């Protein structure tokens, strides 16, 4: 009789107490997620920053190499100019005999 | 205490809580799933950052060696350009004596 009233009072008090717990779980999950998407956004910007830095270094390595081949060519030209001038200095010394 | 109207009221209150509990549970299941993908996404960008930091250190060392060989060459050019000037001046002074 009044027996089923008690089984139902326990069931209700249990549901309301579970509703408090589920609500705080939702509040906690939403907060744990806000920090997480702020973290993911930070690393996305960090990746993009590092990709820009890498492109910059790549272009810089290209220019350095371009300038280097130019200097190696310049050295070869000057090294030959020396050889030709030393030989001219040698032939002048040789004629004064 | 002769009326079970509290049963009819306690059953309409309970069935309403049970239906709300289904909705709250799927919200929790959906938040937990949205978070698992997000944690996986963050882990993927962490490895992408680390990969890009390795790559950056490599390019930096490479740019440093290129800059080092360039300073060496610029110095070499200056030495050779001076050797030329000194030899041309010797050739000039010999020409000058052969005139006087």
Residue numbers in the entry:
A (entry chain D): 12 to 108
B (entry chain A): 10 to 109
Reproduce text from the manuscript describing this model.
Centrioles have proximal-distal polarity and a 9-fold radial symmetry imparted by a likewise symmetrical central scaffold, the cartwheel.
We succeeded in crystalizing a fragment of the coiled-coil domain from each species, with different boundaries, but spanning approximately the middle one-third of this protein region (henceforth, CrSAS-6_CCMiddle, DrSAS-6_CCMiddle, and HsSAS-6_CCMiddle; see Figure S2A for the protein sequence alignment, Table 1 for a list of recombinant protein constructs, and Figure S1A for SDS-PAGE analysis of these constructs). As the HsSAS-6_CCMiddle and DrSAS-6_CCMiddle fragments did not originally include methionine residues, one or two amino acids, respectively, were mutated to methionine to allow SeMet incorporation. Both the HsSAS-6_CCMiddle and DrSAS-6_CCMiddle crystal structures revealed primarily antiparallel associations between their coiled coils, with only much smaller parallel associations between coiled-coil copies, which were offset by approximately one-half length or the full length of the crystallographic c-axis, respectively. A previous hypothesis posited that STIL/SAS-5/Ana2, an essential centriolar component that forms higher-order oligomers (Cottee et al., 2015; David et al., 2016; Rogala et al., 2015; Shimanovskaya et al., 2013) and binds to SAS-6 (Dzhindzhev et al., 2014; Hilbert et al., 2013; Ohta et al., 2014; Qiao et al., 2012), could cross-link SAS-6 copies, thereby stabilizing SAS-6 oligomer formation and their 3D arrangement.
